[PDB]
Ligand binder design. Structure first.
Ligand SMILES: *[C@@H]1O[C@H](CO)[C@@H](O)[C@H](O)[C@H]1NC(C)=O
Ligand SMILES: [Cu+2]
Ligand SMILES: [Cu+2]
Ligand SMILES: [Mg+2]
Ligand SMILES: [Mg+2]
Ligand SMILES: [Mg+2]
Ligand SMILES: [O]
Ligand SMILES: [O]
Lengths: 325, 325
């Protein structure tokens, strides 16, 4: 319940995340703790814990050892159910005990996500430093070749340090700027910005995220402008913009893999967008784009009942970030 | 090409000449717009058009399939017995720059009946380079002096992606810088060859004004006119002997092959004057003086660089060319 103990608890919870916990205290908690045993530890008197326990007891949660994507609606909903519990804990023993309990029940990708945003958005997390995700889930930051050498080092029980090279070949001019988007710290900057300012945030979680929609515009504007500065530094032209009715010129082979789920897929050069089953038609993206530009060129956003919300004012850019993200 | 030497124009047609017209007319392919022929339809103008070089690489690759079909040269094919190239060096820096050149536009304008001419000139910026001297040290361990052909090429080391080229990947990219025949005395001697004497290049043409002045002065004074110091107009301009290179400098391979001049010039005399442009423009009124295939010894595949490295009469060295902006 002090910062040293909280930091150690988090360190332990995130250690060797693909395996059952090796810490005797956390194993005991995962075995014996009942998230519904004392609802006085929650600000919602157990409402969020009841929702998550029902999903768990009905065998409706994603299995362990499976890929996780925050953009997958149902998997995100499951991670946010655990976030919701952690976010309701009044004191650290509630936060730690629920984390230990659900670590052993829930998918590891969902758990890591929920624990990180739980620490970030709870006052109980104040003073904790989250370990870098590239050491908690290295597969998401390390190409498959190096992971295999790590797998080989483990299979052979020999220590080693292995050099990571950038993806692609020298024939690929885009490799000239791979040090930007592949930098592990740039990746942590990006994930952490979205953890700090999540698109799923609702103020019923406890507070408002000030100017979030405008900061969404700004942080990505700066990523784009910074990338273009690297291109300029490497005798490359600025990036083109995507358009739904034109080819995506530059393909990509990540040469990276999930821990569970297989290799990340590749995209060939010069492809037209295809409709994605279960997601959207390309035409839907064009219509959505058109509707956003209609608001911009009207000078107002149209509310659900048809009334106008003026955006010809300083908060207009923020409201646009709200509707665009 | 095709030329009137073609044994069967009815069947093989005229790929290259027809392609000049096909490309030249793509701005008005059906004659609907009354446009005149394109720049590709004149030898004066064809190289102005970027597509000239795409068309001529296409044609070059046709020839290359034939030249690639022969067996690679062997050590015994290439060795000039008892002739070693001990060293290749250049006296003077390899430096390029742009300077100014003027020519008259008077013939382009319309002259009035009994109104006086006025001087009207164009001033163009043209590539140029400083003079330099090859120093090729050769050891003749044959028991007598021997005629030798010195063949000098400039070859890329790396491509535009910074990838180091094999000899086989460089050879078709090499540019001819010189070819000359010279008696090599017994022993070790350094042959000196000025850049200005290249058999690949010819100087800038004398102006029309200068030719009029010289002819008029001779006719009006009853003097003989001796223009024999003037060279032919066929040949790479002296000023363009070297590629522009970069202000930061670029490194290239300077390739020197010394071959048996008695064999190469058999029937064409190694003492006779072969003019100043015989490498690509031949000898006016005479047979071509070098019996070897054009491009020798780089015109066949070199899959095994060890073969060339084991031939004492072949040597390449790294040189640097700097552009002065
Ligand atoms: C890995 O990189 C280090 C320094 O960056 C270097 O000392 C070592 O030679 C490299 N290892 C391999 C196998 O190339
Ligand atoms: Cu983002
Ligand atoms: Cu031609
Ligand atoms: Mg599945
Ligand atoms: Mg000459
Ligand atoms: Mg050899
Ligand atoms: O040509
Ligand atoms: O040509």
């Amino acid at each position: 319940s002090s910062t040293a103990h909280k930091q150690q608890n988090i360190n332990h919870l995130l250690d060797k995340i693909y395996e059952d916990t090796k810490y005797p205290d956390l194993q005991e908690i995962a075995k014996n703790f009942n998230p519904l045993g004392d609802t006085s530890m929650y600000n919602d008197q157990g409402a969020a814990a009841e929702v998550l326990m029902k999903e768990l007891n009905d065998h409706r949660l994603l299995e362990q050892h499976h890929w996780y994507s925050l953009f997958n609606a149902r998997q995100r909903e499951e991670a946010l159910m655990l976030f919701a519990v952690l976010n309701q804990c009044k004191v650290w023993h509630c936060f730690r005990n629920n984390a230990a309990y659900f670590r052993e029940q829930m998918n590891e990708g969902e758990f890591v996500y929920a624990l990180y945003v739980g620490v970030i958005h709870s006052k109980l997390g104040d003073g904790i430093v989250l370990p870098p995700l590239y050491e908690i889930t290295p597969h998401m930051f390390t190409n498959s070749e190096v992971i295999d050498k790590a797998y080989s080092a483990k299979m052979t029980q020999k220590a080693g340090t292995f050099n990571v090279s950038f993806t692609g070949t020298k024939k690929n001019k885009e490799q000239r700027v791979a040090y930007f988007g592949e930098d592990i710290g740039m990746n942590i900057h990006h994930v952490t910005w979205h953890m700090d300012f999540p698109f799923w945030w609702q103020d019923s979680y406890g507070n408002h995220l000030d100017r979030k929609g405008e900061l969404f515009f700004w942080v990505h504007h700066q990523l784009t402008a910074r990338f273009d500065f690297e291109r300029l530094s490497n005798w490359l032209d600025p990036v083109d913009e995507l358009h739904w009715d034109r080819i995506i010129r530059e393909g990509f082979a990540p040469l990276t893999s999930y821990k569970y789920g297989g290799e990340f897929p590749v995209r060939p050069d010069n492809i037209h967008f295809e409709d994605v089953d279960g997601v959207a038609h390309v035409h839907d993206m064009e219509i959505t784009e058109n509707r956003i530009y209609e608001a911009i060129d009207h000078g107002y956003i149209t509310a659900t009942d048809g009334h106008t919300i003026d955006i010809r004012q300083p908060k207009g850019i923020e409201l646009l970030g709200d509707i665009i993200e | 090409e095709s030329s009137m030497y073609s044994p069967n124009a009815q069947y093989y047609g005229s790929l290259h000449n027809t392609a000049h017209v096909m490309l030249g007319r793509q701005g008005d392919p059906h004659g609907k717009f009354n446009l005149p022929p394109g720049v590709m339809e004149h030898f004066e103008t064809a190289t102005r058009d970027p597509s000239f070089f795409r068309l001529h690489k296409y044609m070059d690759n046709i020839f290359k399939k034939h030249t690639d079909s022969f067996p690679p040269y062997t050590h015994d094919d290439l060795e000039f017995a008892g002739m070693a190239v001990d060293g290749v060096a250049i006296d003077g820096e390899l430096i390029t720059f742009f300077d100014e050149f003027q020519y008259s536009l008077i013939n382009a304008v319309d002259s009035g009946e009994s109104i006086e001419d006025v001087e009207i000139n164009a001033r163009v910026h043209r590539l140029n380079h400083k003079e330099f001297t090859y120093k090729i040290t050769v050891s003749n361990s044959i028991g007598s002096d021997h005629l030798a052909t010195f063949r000098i090429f400039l070859c890329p080391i790396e491509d535009n992606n910074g990838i180091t080229l094999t000899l086989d990947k460089a050879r078709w990219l090499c540019i001819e810088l010189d070819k000359f025949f010279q008696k090599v005395p017994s022993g070790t001697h350094t042959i000196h060859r000025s850049s200005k004497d290249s058999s690949v290049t010819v100087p800038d043409m004398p102006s029309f004004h200068s030719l009029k002045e010289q002819a008029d002065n001779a006719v009006n004074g009853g003097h003989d006119l001796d223009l024999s110091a003037y060279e032919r107009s066929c040949g790479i301009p002296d000023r363009m002997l070297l590629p522009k290179s970069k202000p930061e400098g670029m490194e290239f391979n300077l390739f020197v092959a010394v071959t048996d001049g008695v064999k190469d010039t058999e029937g064409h005399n190694g003492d006779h004057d072969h003019g100043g442009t015989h490498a690509q423009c031949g000898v006016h009124g005479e047979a071509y003086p070098d019996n070897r295939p054009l491009g020798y010894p780089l015109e066949r595949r070199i899959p095994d660089e060890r073969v060339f490295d084991g031939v004492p009469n072949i040597k390449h060295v790294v040189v640097k060319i700097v552009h002065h902006p």
